Symmetry: D2
Subunit: 298 residues, 4 copies
Amino acid sequence: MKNFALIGAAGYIAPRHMRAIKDTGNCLVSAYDINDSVGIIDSISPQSEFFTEFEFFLDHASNLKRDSATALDYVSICSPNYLHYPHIAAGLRLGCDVICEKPLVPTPEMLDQLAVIERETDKRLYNILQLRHHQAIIALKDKVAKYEVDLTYITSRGNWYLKSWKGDPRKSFGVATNIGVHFYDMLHFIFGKLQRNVVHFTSEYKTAGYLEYEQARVRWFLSVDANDLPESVKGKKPTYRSITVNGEEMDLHTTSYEEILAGRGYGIDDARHCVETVNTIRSAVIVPASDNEGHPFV
Amino acid sequence: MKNFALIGAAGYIAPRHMRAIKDTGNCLVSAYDINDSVGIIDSISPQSEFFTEFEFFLDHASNLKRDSATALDYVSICSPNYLHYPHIAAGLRLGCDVICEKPLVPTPEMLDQLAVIERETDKRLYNILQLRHHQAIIALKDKVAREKSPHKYEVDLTYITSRGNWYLKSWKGDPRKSFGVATNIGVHFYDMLHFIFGKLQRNVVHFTSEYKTAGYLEYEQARVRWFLSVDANDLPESVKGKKPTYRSITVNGEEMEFDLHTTSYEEILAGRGYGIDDARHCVETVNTIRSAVIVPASDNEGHPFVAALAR
Amino acid sequence: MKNFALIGAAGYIAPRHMRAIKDTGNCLVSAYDINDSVGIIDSISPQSEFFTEFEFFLDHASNLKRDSATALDYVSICSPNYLHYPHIAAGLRLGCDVICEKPLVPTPEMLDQLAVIERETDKRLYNILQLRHHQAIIALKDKVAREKSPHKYEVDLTYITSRGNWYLKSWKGDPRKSFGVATNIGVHFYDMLHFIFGKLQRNVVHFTSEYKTAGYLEYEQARVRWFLSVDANDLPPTYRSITVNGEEMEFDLHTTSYEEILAGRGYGIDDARHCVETVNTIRSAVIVPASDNEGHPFV
Amino acid sequence: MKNFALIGAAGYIAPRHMRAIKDTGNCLVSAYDINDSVGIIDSISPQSEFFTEFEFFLDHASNLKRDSATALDYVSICSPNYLHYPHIAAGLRLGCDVICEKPLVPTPEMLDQLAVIERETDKRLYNILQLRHHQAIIALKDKVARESPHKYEVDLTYITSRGNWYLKSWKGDPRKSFGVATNIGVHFYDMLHFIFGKLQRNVVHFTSEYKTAGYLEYEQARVRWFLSVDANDLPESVKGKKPTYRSITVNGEEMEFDLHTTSYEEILAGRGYGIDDARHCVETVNTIRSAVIVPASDNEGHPFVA
Ligand SMILES: NC(=O)c1ccc[n+]([C@@H]2O[C@H](COP(=O)([O-])OP(=O)(O)OC[C@H]3O[C@@H](n4cnc5c(N)ncnc54)[C@H](O)[C@@H]3O)[C@@H](O)[C@H]2O)c1
Ligand SMILES: NC(=O)c1ccc[n+]([C@@H]2O[C@H](COP(=O)([O-])OP(=O)(O)OC[C@H]3O[C@@H](n4cnc5c(N)ncnc54)[C@H](O)[C@@H]3O)[C@@H](O)[C@H]2O)c1
Ligand SMILES: NC(=O)c1ccc[n+]([C@@H]2O[C@H](COP(=O)([O-])OP(=O)(O)OC[C@H]3O[C@@H](n4cnc5c(N)ncnc54)[C@H](O)[C@@H]3O)[C@@H](O)[C@H]2O)c1
Ligand SMILES: NC(=O)c1ccc[n+]([C@@H]2O[C@H](COP(=O)([O-])OP(=O)(O)OC[C@H]3O[C@@H](n4cnc5c(N)ncnc54)[C@H](O)[C@@H]3O)[C@@H](O)[C@H]2O)c1
C-alpha cells in the first residue's frame, strides 16, 4: 500500500530490497541505476519505471507528487557508499522517508547534516541494521542483560572486488567502514557504549584492532584476502566467520522493512555510534598492541 | 584446460558462459565489463582477473601470451550487439578463437570483413546458435528431410515477451545499439527456421516499430508468417497476467514442443560448432528485415495479428 | 551580485555563458558537467565550485538556499538537447530562474509542462535566441515592419554545416539526443523568420532524413523555401545563404542575451513556442510533393 | 608524411599535440577520447577519424595497417596519468612508436615493464620532457659542467592556482594522478637532474593534496622545493595579477625564464627522450610519493614551509 523508489537497483543487494518491498505488500514504482542491466526487475515489479540518469528519475518522482495516490512514500538506497549522502538528501527533499544500506554515511558530521534535512522536511532516515532483528544476536543481548570477545571475518574476494568501487577508498571508505560497520553496530547493541578504540593494522585487503565496551573486551580482524583463511578452512568455505565470547563460537531485509513500516525503524540516533566507531578507525593512527589487545591473526 | 576470457561479464547472459566454461573443464582467466557489479564471478571462477577498461584488459591478455601455458585460447563475447564487431576483431587479433553471442553482427558486409580478419590472424569466429543443438529442433529437421512430401509446411511463429520500462531505456532499446526487433529478438528463430526448412526464397515485412514487427518468410520447405513483440499488450487474452511470455510456433497447425549454452561450448571444443558461413543465412535475413520497406500483406501472407492493417 | 550555476560547463558553448556571467558583473558559484575536463573555468571564474555528478550538484545547490546571500538566482543550461527538460525542471524546483540554450525543448507539450512548473515554483524560464539581438536581424525586422507591400517577401534559406568525423560520433549525431536536423540545426533560423515575418500559416516538408531536410514555410509576411544539411556533399566548411527577394542578407551576442534577461527582457516560453512548434512539426512531418514552386532549389 | 593517432584528444593539453603534428608537416589520422566534445580538431585536422570507445579506435588502427601508406607511425598520448601505461602498451603493440605526456608512468618497475614491450614490438617509447629544450636550462647545464668545487644553492617554487574543479577531476584522485609531486612536479625534478647530476638525498617535509615541499641533494646542488595548486600560497605581489608563480633561484639569482612542437621535431629527428632518460625523474617522484615526512633540519626547509 506504500510506494517505493529504489536507487542502485541493478546491483548485488538490490533484489533483496525489491523482494522486501513485494513481500510486505508494497509497490516498487520507480527505479534508478546508472547501469541498465536490471531485467531482474521484471520478475518482481514488472510495472516499475526505470531511469539511468538521476535528472530524469528526479523529474519523474517530482511529477508523481502531484497526485496523493501516485506520490512516493519511500526512497530505498543501495548505491555505492559515497553516494548515500546525496541520495538520502534528495530522498528526504522529495518528501519521502528514506531506507539506506550500511554504512549509512562515513562521518558523524554527515549525520548531523542529514538530521538538519529531516527537520526541514518532516521526513525520516532509516538504516538497514539487519543483524539486530536476528534471533541469536538478541538472545545474547537479552542474555548479557566483562565478556571475552574475539571477532574474525575473512571473506574471500576475487580480483573484481578491488577493481570495483569497493576497492576505491574514496568511494567505499575502507575496510572498517565497508566490511566491518554492522559488526561494530552489533557489538554496541549487545555490549553497550564504547570507551576505547585502537587500531593495530590497516590495508586495502585487511584491518585489525581493539575495542573496549562497558561489557566487552573485543579484539577484531577483517579481511577480503583468501590467504588469511586459517589452514583449517582453506579449500572448503570461501568465508571464515568466527565470533567467540570467552571461547564460545556463537529475509532479514524483509524483516527490516517490516519493522520500518510498523514505525520501529532504526534512525540516525541508532546508527550514530557505529558511524562514530568506523570514522575513528578510518582516520586512526596505527599502534603496536599491548595488554594482549592485538588479535591473534596479527 | 583451455583458457578463456569473457567480455560483457557483468550482464544477464554472462553467467551461462561462465558456467559453460567451468562445466567443460576449462578456465576463465580474465573478464571485462565496463560495469563492476560482477561478484557472481567468485561463485564460478574465483581466480579470474577482472577489468573495467578495455585498455587494461588488452594489456593483460597480451602479457598472457608470453607463456604458452597462460595464453588465451578463446575470447567469449556477451556485450551489446553493436560492440560485437570490434570485440571479435580484438579477440582474433589477440591470437584467440572467438565465441560470440547472437546476433553475431548486423550485416553481411560485416561478416565479409570479419572473414578477412580470420584469414589475417589465422583464428576462427564461432557464433552461439544454441537452438540448433535442441533435440526437438533436430528431430523436426530430420522429420522434414526424410518426409520429402511435395507440399510446403505452413508455419506460424509468434513470440511475445513482456518487457518492462527498463528495456527501452537500456541499449536494447536504442536501435543503433540493438539493431532493432528482428535482429535482436528474432535472429535465432530465423536461424532455426533455416536450419529446419532450408534456403530463404522470399522475405517480406508488414509492420515494424521499436516494440514489435511482423512479416512473411518463404523457405524451400515452409511458408512462415511471423510476429515478434516485447509489448505485454500483444499477449493473447488467455495468457495475460498468468504469464509474461508467449511463444507459439505451429507447423501445419500443430504446436512445436521445446544448458544449451554448455552444449554449444562442448560442440565448439569438439571441433564442431558454427562459424561465419553458418551464421551468414540468418544475418542476411535480419539485415533485409531491418531495412525493408513495408508492403501491404497479400495472399494470406499476413500473420493473424496484422489483419487490420492497410492492404 | 547575482549567483549563477552552469550545467554543461565543460562543453563547447559553455565558455560564452561563463563570460556573459562575468561580463555582466555576476558570479558563477557552481558548475556541473559529467566530464571533468573544465580547467577553462579558472580563467573566467576561479571561485566556482564544480561537480561531476548531479547528486552532488543538487545537494550543494539545495544547501545554498539556506542563506539568501549564497542562494542561487539563475541556473544556466548548456547540456545536450534531450537533457534540457529535466535540467530546467530541476532548476526551477531549486527556486531559481532558468536560462536554457536552444533548442529549448523539442515539443510544445513539453513547453506546457514547463509552464506548469513555472506556476508551481513562481520562477521563470528564459531561452537563448541570440540572433534576435544581431543588428542585421533587427534592421530587417524594422524594414519589413515599415514597408507597406501587400505582397509577401520571397525568402530562400540555405544552411549547410559540415564538420569532421567526430560530429556524428557525438550526441549531435544521435537522433534520440539531438532531436534531428530541423530541431538541432534549424531552430534559431526558424525563430529568426518568425521574428521578422510574423505568424506561421503553412508548414510543409519536402524531404527529411537524419542528415538534411527541406521544406516550405509561409508566414504572414514571407514565403520561405528552406534547406538544411550536415552533409558536405550538399555544399555549393559551411554555406549560409539567406536571400530576401533575391538579395543576400549581410550579417558577444550571448553577453547581450544575458544583459537582456537580467533587465527583465528575456525571451520566455511564449516567445520560444513559435520555433519549437515549427521544428516539432517538421520533425514528424509526412513529406508531400513540391508544388506551386514551393520547393527549395536544392531538392 | 608521418601518420599520427592522438589518445585523450578532447582534453586540455591535446590541442598542443594536434598543433605539433600539424606544424612538423605530419597528419593526424585518428583520435580517441571517451568524451565527445572534441570539435577543436576540425580547426587543425579536419579529416581525422574520431572514436569515443577504445574498441572501435583499435579496430580502425588495425585496419590502417593493411596499407603502408595509411599505417599509423606514432601514437601520441595525453590521457590521465594512470592510463599512460596501457595506452603506451597498445600503441607499441599496434606497431607504432609512442609519444607520451609526463609523468610517463609512476614507478621504475613500470618502466622496466614498458622496456620489455619495446623489445617484443621493436618499437620505441618517447616522453615529453620539454624543459630540456628551454634555451635557459641548456645554458645552465653547460655553465655548470665546465666550471666548480662547491654546490649550487637552489630554491624552486611553483605555485599554480587551481580552483575547486581540480580535486574533483582525475587530477585529485591519488590512484589516477599519483599525487601532486608526480603530476605537477615531475618535469622540474627532471630539469634538476638534467642540470645538476645524480640525486644523492631525497627528503620530504610536507605533503597534502594541494601542495608539497622537500629537499633534494644532487652531486652539484642543494635544492629546496615547494609545489602548490593553492592560490593562497602565491606571494602577495602576484595575488590578483597572475594565477601562477614560478621561481628558480641559483645562488640567490633568479633563473632567466611552443615547446611541444620542439619536442616533436626532436623525436622526429631521432633525438627523442626514452625510458632511460625518464628513469631518473620517475625514481625521484616514486620516492617522494611513498616518503615518510620528516621535520626540516639544517635549514633544508623551503622558506614557504615555515
Ligand atoms: N546489508 C547488507 O548485508 C549488505 C550486503 C551487501 C551490500 N550492502 C550495501 O549495499 C550497497 C550496495 O552494495 P552492492 O554490493 O549491491 O554493490 P553493487 O556495486 O553491486 O551495486 C551498486 C549499484 O549502484 C549503482 N550505481 C552506481 N552509481 C550510481 C548512481 N549515481 N546512482 C544510482 N545507482 C548507482 C551501480 O551501477 C550498481 O548497480 C552498499 O552501500 C553496500 O555497502 C549491504
Ligand atoms: N543466446 C541467447 O539466447 C541470448 C540470450 C540473451 C542475450 N543474448 C545476447 O547476449 C548479449 C548480451 O545480452 P545481455 O541480455 O546479457 O545484455 P546485458 O545488457 O545484461 O549485458 C551486457 C553487458 O555488456 C557490458 N558492456 C557494455 N559495454 C561494454 C564494453 N564496451 N565492453 C565490455 N562490456 C560492455 C554491460 O555493462 C553489460 O554488463 C547480446 O548480444 C544478446 O543478444 C543471447
Ligand atoms: N546558442 C547557440 O548558438 C548555440 C551554439 C552551440 C550550441 N548550442 C546549444 O548548446 C548546448 C550545448 O551544445 P555544445 O555545442 O556546447 O555541445 P557539447 O557537447 O560541447 O557540450 C555539452 C556538455 O554537456 C555535458 N553533459 C552531458 N551530459 C550531461 C549531464 N547529464 N549533466 C551535465 N552535463 C552534461 C557534456 O559532457 C558536455 O561538456 C546544446 O543544446 C546546443 O544546441 C547553442
Ligand atoms: N607537458 C606538460 O607541460 C603538460 C601540461 C598539462 C598536462 N600534461 C599532461 O597531459 C595529460 C593530460 O592532461 P590534461 O590536463 O590535458 O587533462 P584533461 O583531463 O583535460 O584531458 C584528459 C583527456 O583524457 C580523456 N580520457 C579519459 N580517459 C580516457 C581513456 N580511457 N581513453 C582516452 N581518453 C581518455 C579525458 O576525457 C580528457 O579529454 C596528463 O598526463 C597531464 O599530466 C602535461
